[PDB]
């Protein structure tokens, strides 16, 4: 067979299995009206939306815990919290039960109390989905490694944009493949949203 | 071409200026010299470093490297050749060595502490592997208010698997470059800085 290479968790024997919905809680990352338009547009929406109000329904008819996740923002500027780039995107709104915080670092720990949420909710497995992959996604997916958290990161719930590298412009599909071979490799069991619904 | 997060948001700084700045080698260690884990673009990636490093000690700047750990029968076995550092690049006396165990080079390390300590918000950062202790130390750096400027031709990684395949190294190396100057470092090449 073809020779290829080895993630870090083979390589150190450190894999964990992938997270099944019914022992997990599940966090939905900045799915806010910012990301639907403007220079933050990003690629893949429409059904990176449709895949996280597929988890979100399978989370509510399950009983799980969910946790969403939006930026504070800034009042007349980006995820302008008294405007619409703030909201959240239709159809993701958190109901009656949902745990909601506010951020403002790409890491969702930081000053927030995800911590102590997530030690009261009692599950070392979390199910990560949300906006951008490789800036707060990629950040709290690491962060939670450090809490001794298995993360398993839903790839087609979760999207980015495209990227300047110098002058020059590498698609959302690259930078999002690679941040999923990234997160794969020694940070996330990566998934599709069909495997856990 | 992309505007960035930082742009947007007002955010953005200046790259570091080694006068001002504090340097950090994250695991330039024989590991990645060879073997499962031998990384592409070393010889020029440690030949950047050396530079790096000559440029701060003629300068007189704190230099803090970073080593792994390592575990008998894993990586970087602290009893042999795997856990040394790559030769030209070891410390000299005067030095910080900070040994960690996580990608995040400030878990259960006295980095932030040590970095207080030396007083510099902007920090230059090169080393190993790009994707993993690079970006996680560097993402970490953001929330403690660092500035970090990241060397993108004094670090490397490793070719990894994905579900369509392979990506090599030189496709990871770029993403996360790109990655990087979106929102968690100016990415700057070694020239720029000596």
Redesign the interface.
């Known amino acids: 067979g073809m020779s290829?290479?080895?993630?870090?968790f083979r390589?150190?024997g450190r894999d964990y299995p992938p997270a099944k919905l019914s022992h997990a809680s599940l966090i939905i990352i900045d799915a806010q009206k910012e990301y639907l338009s403007g220079?933050?547009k990003l690629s893949g929406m429409d059904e990176a939306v449709a895949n996280i109000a597929r988890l979100l329904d399978a989370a509510r008819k399950s009983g799980r815990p969910i946790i969403h996740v939006r930026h504070l923002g800034?009042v007349g500027?980006?995820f302008d919290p008294q405007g619409p780039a703030g909201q959240f995107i239709p159809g993701l709104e958190p109901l009656e039960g949902e745990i909601v915080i506010e951020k403002r670092?790409?890491?969702a720990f930081?000053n927030t109390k995800l911590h102590e949420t997530l030690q009261e909710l009692g599950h070392l497995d979390l199910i990560v989905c949300g906006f951008m992959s490789?800036?707060s996604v990629?950040?709290t997916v690491?962060?939670a490694?450090?809490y001794g958290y298995r993360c398993t990161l839903v790839?087609d719930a979760s999207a980015t944009?495209?990227?300047?590298?110098k002058?020059?412009?590498?698609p959302a599909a690259?930078?999002h493949?690679?941040?999923?071979?990234?997160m794969?490799?020694?940070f996330a069991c990566?998934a599709p949203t069909a495997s856990l619904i």
């Open positions: 290829v290479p080895t993630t870090m390589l150190t220079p933050l800034t500027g980006r670092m790409p890491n930081k490789h800036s990629s950040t690491r962060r490694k450090d790839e944009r495209d990227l300047a590298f002058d020059g412009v590498i690259q930078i493949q690679c941040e999923m071979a990234v794969a490799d020694n990566v």
